[PDB]
């Protein structure tokens, strides 16, 4: 399928239920070609674990880890930062909100 | 573009039962309906505000 | 208007000297900055904050 | 032409038109009739320095609408002749009292 | 508790205000007042934004003139605090009406 | 169902609320003209004083 | 319609080559103009009924009380060189 | 079809608060009064300039509706403005 798997997924809590790997490394292949991709698979199915492993997978492989963004809904804004609190927490995460003082 | 359904996971996968409830209209609920609904379809079809 | 633009070459001088102060400023904060990460380094930071 | 005859740059034709149109008297003084405007011209020398210069003291390039408002309101002189009329998007020279502060 | 004296904060604001040269009346409720007080006349009106724009900013200058007037009469006398008569005292010596 | 619907429509819900309107709007025109009557009646005493 | 931005354009480029001008300012300054020309020209309207008849002499007197007289003395005489050299 | 009653007639064709008040608030006079440098103020000041807009505003509204009326223009311009500032001994410049 024009993808090569070869992760080194460190300081990454859990594991890929053999469902997100083929994600990961679809979403890999889009980085090595300077792609843009789409995961629109069925909602619940782990959308948040797949891109926080392709984050990792960038940090580990390359030594690229500058500040990224991840434009959420606000329901989910305290989520994503616990999703990978008890995933990977090797990551520094910021949540932006909350009046301008703080 | 990447899209994968239920079908990639069923082996420990709860099912989806559809139910559609009928439910009636009370009598001072019905009024209002058709007031509205006569209003609305007298002035519609015409000339309003 | 002499006055002002005398005012004013003063503003200029000492735009100027703030200028090259916080040029220096950046010169010393990037050799206090950190430098080359690496692998060994960046993991270790990674494995605290973890 | 005769602006530049005369040393002046403002059009004093129009000026003469628009002192036609007024009627403010049957026949004009058309041995100077550009002398108005070169009273006016002298006039918009001085508050164009004076905002010019505002300008310049606060490092903006161009005229800022409250630069003029302090160099018309700084010259005494100036408020002396243009005091009841006010500027728009103008300010207050900052004027706190000796005795107030703590 | 960063609780500073009454009126310590005060000058440094008044200071951030007479600095700046911008809109301090809220534009909406300025044009609920607008149309309330000109229906009183005639009906389909068809104001123009700037000629609301125009007078609020004319009504502003002329309350900051007055206010600053005002401050003056008051630090006449042995007074901090503004009340009713400074600012009749100040609205009747022009005689404005 | 057809003459009870049409009996409790002649009278009505939505007729309660026009009744209402009509009533706000009465008493609106009536503060207006009063309004309207105190401003002709301080304007002329002004001109009188004036 | 003849604007007046040319004008006050020149004169400021004459007197700073490299200030810039902002949009309100050009209103601000054509307004100045404006009102200023008009008051000046019915201050010396008044001054022709003052004078029991129907030149340069009554514009002069009328800039000679309209503005601050330090001002005024440097008016009065830039316009009468400003007319000199217009004379030939 | 003629006989029986039902509906399917479309219709003929119906009809079917301007009071308004005034806005300001006790904030925007506490900032319009720091620009006029005040250090401490009472409580009774915010009547008070609400009384200065409420005899301030509606004169010069007057005198522009009927300056436009006599302008003979079914409309309001902000040009309309300028005469009644400068008939007020307040004139505006930039409009
Ligand atoms: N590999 C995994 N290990 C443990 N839990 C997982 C894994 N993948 C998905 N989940 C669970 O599935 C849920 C999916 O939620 P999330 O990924 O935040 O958004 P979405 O529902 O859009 O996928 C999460 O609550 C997460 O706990
Ligand atoms: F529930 Be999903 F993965 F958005």
Known sequence: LSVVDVPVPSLLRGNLRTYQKQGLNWLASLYNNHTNGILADEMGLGKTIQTISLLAYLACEKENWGPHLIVVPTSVLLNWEMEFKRFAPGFKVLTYYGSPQQ | ?49 | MENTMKVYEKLSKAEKKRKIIQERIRKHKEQESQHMLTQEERLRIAKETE | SRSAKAGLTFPVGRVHRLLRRGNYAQRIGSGAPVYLTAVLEYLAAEILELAGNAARDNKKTRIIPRHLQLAIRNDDELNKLLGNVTIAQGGVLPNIHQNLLP | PHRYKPGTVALREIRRFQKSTELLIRKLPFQRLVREIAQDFKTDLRFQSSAIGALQESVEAYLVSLFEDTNLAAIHAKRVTIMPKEIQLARRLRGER | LNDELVLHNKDGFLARQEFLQRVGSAEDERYKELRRQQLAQQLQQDSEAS | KETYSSYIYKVLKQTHPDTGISQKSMSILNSFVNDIFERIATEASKLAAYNKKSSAREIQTAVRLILPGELAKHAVSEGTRAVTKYSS | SGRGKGGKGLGKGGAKLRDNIQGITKPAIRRLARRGGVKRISGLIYEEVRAVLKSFLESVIRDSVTYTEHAKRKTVTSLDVVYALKRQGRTLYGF
């Open chain 2, 1 to 49: 573009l990447l899209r994968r359904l239920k079908a990639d996971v069923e082996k420990q996968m709860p099912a989806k039962y559809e139910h559609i409830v009928y439910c009636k209209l009370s009598k001072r609920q019905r009024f209002l309906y058709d007031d509205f609904m006569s209003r609305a379809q007298t002035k519609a079809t015409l000339a309003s505000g």
